[PDB]
Design a protein around this ligand. Structure first.
Ligand code: SAH
Ligand code: SAH
Lengths: 251, 237
């Protein structure tokens, strides 16, 4: 069914149903990022912008609020429908710089090039390694000359750190430097009410892919982009910096 | 063209003017034999290199089809086989092949692969491996893998709490399960990156594609000291 996490295991045992184990995407009770959008803006606008897997407009609207023309591309027709509902209930000027398009960000093709192409950490992490290559290839084909590819990328503690070195003393028949660089983790969340009474006690688990920023960056280089900047920021305006803003251009 | 690490460039100028980078299988093979039993019927070792484990396996008396991709490496292996005595040599059948896609039309009691071999495939190819391996297992037959386990892979992931409102108050728990790291080397008076899967990540992948993983046994590769490897047992339901 849902993912049975270790903390959830204990809770659900302790609470005896009453408690219910759920994935974080079914029911139910269960988006604001103007600080992330702002991070994207800082790091650019000449022309129109393409947002990939724009979901429901979490960033797309903030972008439109800054006067930008946005082609928002989404795969889910249902999310697409919901986006178009929000879009319907907003000022015709706001409405008219926005273009929705169904599409697969791993293999998409528009009758249009673009000065700026943006993708949020949430989205890039939906793709495996193969599709990620598809994305890079695709994007390259949609950048006007000199245009930037801007990516936000969540940064785990392990990816934030300077990987631990281990020097050695191995003679031949030298000094050896090993590093274990992070490439990909699984972010696992568990959310439950602070009580235990409540009734019902719904326990929310989710597992998702979480790529190391440096990893994406290597992928990017390997695929013909140059990464001209990488900038840590906190997603909620202040706190620990838990995100990296990456700029890529075609050489 | 060769990978330019941080420690390289801080030695590349911190020297002036005066390249990429391209062990004993006894303990390791024994660990495989521990989780094998009988053995009735022959064994198939995928990506056998040049016999580092194969020769151990033969000394356990086993019958081994050793699959390897490389024409050059097969040349080495064949010569080594030729210097072995004849009962060793006659229990070893070499085959050029691709561990990610191969038919051999025969099935095997046991199927075996080494950490270095599986770490050489990306995700898609590993999907193919498990599919192949399946196609080549006799029922009840065991699929054994050894997997390097780094310090990241073995540690209990650190957990972060945090209280949040609505207006209902919630508790939020976040763990980071390791899955893939990069092994980066700098040899030194010389460079190499490489894949290093988390044994757990491989296990998840085995389940995702058919097998029930019946055992995960940590062992030292050297055959002494800290257990730096994991022997995984898989079978087809
Ligand atoms: N292959 C694909 N092609 C296009 N969109 C995809 C996709 N796979 C997943 N998605 C979409 O990517 C979104 C990920 S969540 C990101 C939403 C938004 N950019 C934000 O910042 O909140 C989801 O809306 C999902 O429908
Ligand atoms: N796809 C593949 N199929 C079979 N053997 C492979 C392979 N890729 C790499 N190898 C071999 O596995 C060994 C890695 S140890 C090397 O000997 C290498 O030549």
């Amino acid at each position: 069914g849902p993912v049975r996490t270790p903390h959830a295991d204990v809770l659900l045992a302790s609470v005896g149903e009453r408690g219910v184990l759920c994935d974080f995407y079914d029911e139910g009770a269960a988006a604001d990022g103007t600080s992330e959008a702002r991070e994207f803006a800082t790091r650019t606008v000449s022309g129109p912008v393409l947002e990939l897997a724009a979901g429901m407009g979490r960033l797309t609207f903030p972008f439109l609020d800054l006067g930008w023309e946005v082609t928002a591309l989404e795969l889910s027709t249902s999310v697409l429908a919901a986006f178009r509902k929000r879009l319907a209930e907003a000022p015709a000027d706001v409405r008219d710089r926005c273009t929705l398009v169904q599409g697969d960000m791993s293999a998409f093709a528009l009758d249009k090039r673009f000065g700026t192409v943006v993708i949020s950490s949430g989205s890039i992490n939906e793709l495996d390694e193969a599709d990620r290559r598809g994305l890079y290839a695709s994007v390259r084909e949609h950048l006007e000359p000199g245009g930037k590819f801007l990516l936000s990328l969540a940064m785990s503690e392990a990816a934030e750190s300077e990987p631990l070195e281990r020097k050695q003393e191995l003679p031949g028949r030298y000094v050896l430097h090993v590093r274990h660089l992070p490439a990909e983790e699984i972010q696992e969340i568990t959310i439950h009410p602070a009580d235990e009474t409540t009734d019902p006690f719904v326990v929310c688990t989710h597992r998702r892919r979480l790529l190391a920023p440096d990893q994406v960056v290597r992928e990017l280089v390997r695929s013909g982009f140059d990464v001209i900047a990488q900038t840590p920021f906190a997603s909620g305006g202040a706190g620990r910096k838990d995100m990296v803003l990456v700029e890529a251009v075609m050489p």
